[PDB]
């Protein structure tokens, strides 16, 4: 389908990060899934480069690839983690969950 | 000053939208049949200004529902 | 191959923008081409989300997709364009050429 | 304080690099044979800290060329 934010739940144990992230056991990270087909909707905040590349790809699919659906604003989460064996509270662990998808 | 436009595309939350101008975009992707999109524009007014090509054609207008049943053609 | 900036020359006439862009007739826009395979090199400035998503994709390719190679810094170019039939000089037409690729 | 590390990966400009620590990363992508990367680290020290899994294992060290011929194993 078209580029949009979709659910993606991360379990820290599944990727081995529970060795140092004490809490929470996981969180809703989301992901950006879908194609960026011309014309690029304005809520996907396309750049001029993405628009031009999308146009060239339309004319010749081997000269340029499609623009890509990627996160454009990320949000922090709060965690507890081990710092030298000491459980500490990190208020804004930045860049962890998608708030906005975009075409780039 | 915004204008109300017919909305007819995968990205529409309803039958109309409001924006600075109304749009129709005709797109032919390689190997497929040309597909028509109708909506509103607020950024990238310059897209309105491009010459039609074999693969794309833009139309923009700024009257109430001015894009409702406009139909475009592509270059040969 | 791997995510990197690659050549991409844009001819304004080919996409119909010569009706309003008077000069230059085209420019080197570049594009970001390639896969973002774990581990994500630090010069691709991956976010934490991209790293985590890359890790989940490694464990299950149907739970999340790979991170994506996209431009992360764009540069302006200078143009001449028609404003109501008057040829004018736009010094920094922003967001037109890739200076940096990245995994997101 | 930087350390010099063996560089052995698609992203190396040469046989060594300098960074805050040295790295080895063993990666098994679905359906393929595990692949070993060696290089330096400056960000994402936390990756050094993850428990090994069936699909990935990180090793980090901060001595001169300390990653030169370290070899890792993945979980069963």
Curated annotation (Swiss-Prot), chains A, C:
GO terms for molecular function: cytokine activity; growth factor activity; hormone activity; receptor serine/threonine kinase binding; telethonin binding. Keywords: Cell adhesion, Cleavage on pair of basic residues, Cytokine, Developmental protein, Disease variant, Disulfide bond, Glycoprotein, Growth factor, Secreted, Signal. Induction: Down-regulated in some breast cancer subtypes and breast cancer cell lines. One of its GO terms (cellular component) is cytoplasm. GO terms for biological process: activin receptor signaling pathway; adult heart development; atrial cardiac muscle tissue morphogenesis; BMP signaling pathway; cardiac muscle cell proliferation; cell adhesion; heart trabecula formation; kidney development. It is found in: Secreted. Detected in mammary epithelia (at protein level). Disulfide bonds join 3-69, 32-101, 36-103. Homodimer; disulfide-linked. Interacts with FBN1 (via N-terminal domain) and FBN2. Interacts with ENG. It is linked to Defects in BMP10 may be a cause of congenital heart defects, a wide spectrum of cardiovascular malformations resulting from anomalous development of the heart, cardiac valves, and endo-thoracic large vessels. Belongs to the TGF-beta family. Required for maintaining the proliferative activity of embryonic cardiomyocytes by preventing premature activation of the negative cell cycle regulator CDKN1C/p57KIP and maintaining the required expression levels of cardiogenic factors such as MEF2C and NKX2-5. Acts as a ligand for ACVRL1/ALK1, BMPR1A/ALK3 and BMPR1B/ALK6, leading to activation of SMAD1, SMAD5 and SMAD8 transcription factors. Inhibits endothelial cell migration and growth. May reduce cell migration and cell matrix adhesion in breast cancer cell lines. This is Bone morphogenetic protein 10. It comes from Homo sapiens (Human).
Curated annotation (Swiss-Prot), chains B, D:
Changing residue 48 to W: In HHT2; retained in the endoplasmic reticulum. Changing residue 21 to C: In HHT2; retained in the endoplasmic reticulum. Changing residue 30 to V: Found in a patient with pulmonary arterial hypertension; uncertain significance. It is found in: Cell membrane. Residues 1-76 are extracellular. Residues 44-47 are annotated as: Mediates specificity for BMP ligand. Changing residue 48 to F: In HHT2; loss of receptor activity in response to BMP9; retained in the endoplasmic reticulum. Glycans are attached at residue 69. Disulfide bonds join 5-22, 7-12, 17-40, 48-60, 61-66. Type I receptor for TGF-beta family ligands BMP9/GDF2 and BMP10 and important regulator of normal blood vessel development. On ligand binding, forms a receptor complex consisting of two type II and two type I transmembrane serine/threonine kinases. Type II receptors phosphorylate and activate type I receptors which autophosphorylate, then bind and activate SMAD transcriptional regulators. May bind activin as well. It is linked to Telangiectasia, hereditary hemorrhagic, 2: A multisystemic vascular dysplasia leading to dilation of permanent blood vessels and arteriovenous malformations of skin, mucosa, and viscera. The disease is characterized by recurrent epistaxis and gastro-intestinal hemorrhage. Visceral involvement includes arteriovenous malformations of the lung, liver, and brain. Interacts with TSC22D1/TSC-22. Belongs to the protein kinase superfamily. TKL Ser/Thr protein kinase family. TGFB receptor subfamily. This is Activin receptor type-1-like. It comes from Homo sapiens (Human). The gene is ACVRL1. The chain holds residues 30 to 105 of 503 of the full protein.
């Amino acid at each position: 389908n078209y580029c949009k934010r979709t659910p993606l739940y991360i379990d820290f144990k599944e990727i081995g990060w529970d060795s140092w992230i004490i809490a929470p056991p996981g969180y809703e990270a989301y992901e950006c899934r879908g194609v960026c087909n011309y014309p690029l909707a304005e809520h996907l905040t396309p750049t001029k480069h993405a628009i031009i590349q999308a146009l060239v790809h339309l004319k010749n699919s081997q000269k340029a690839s499609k623009a890509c659906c990627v996160p454009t604003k990320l949000e922090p989460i709060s965690i507890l983690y081990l710092d030298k064996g000491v459980v500490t509270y990190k208020f804004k662990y930045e860049g962890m969950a998608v708030s906005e998808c975009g075409c780039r | 000053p915004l204008v109300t436009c017919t909305c007819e595309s995968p990205h529409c939350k309803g039958p109309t939208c409001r924006g600075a101008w109304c749009t129709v975009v005709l797109v032919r992707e390689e190997g497929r049949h040309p597909q028509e999109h109708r909506g509103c524009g607020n950024l990238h007014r310059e897209l309105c200004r491009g010459r039609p090509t074999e693969f794309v054609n833009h139309y923009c207008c700024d009257s109430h529902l001015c894009n409702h049943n406009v139909s475009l053609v592509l270059e040969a």
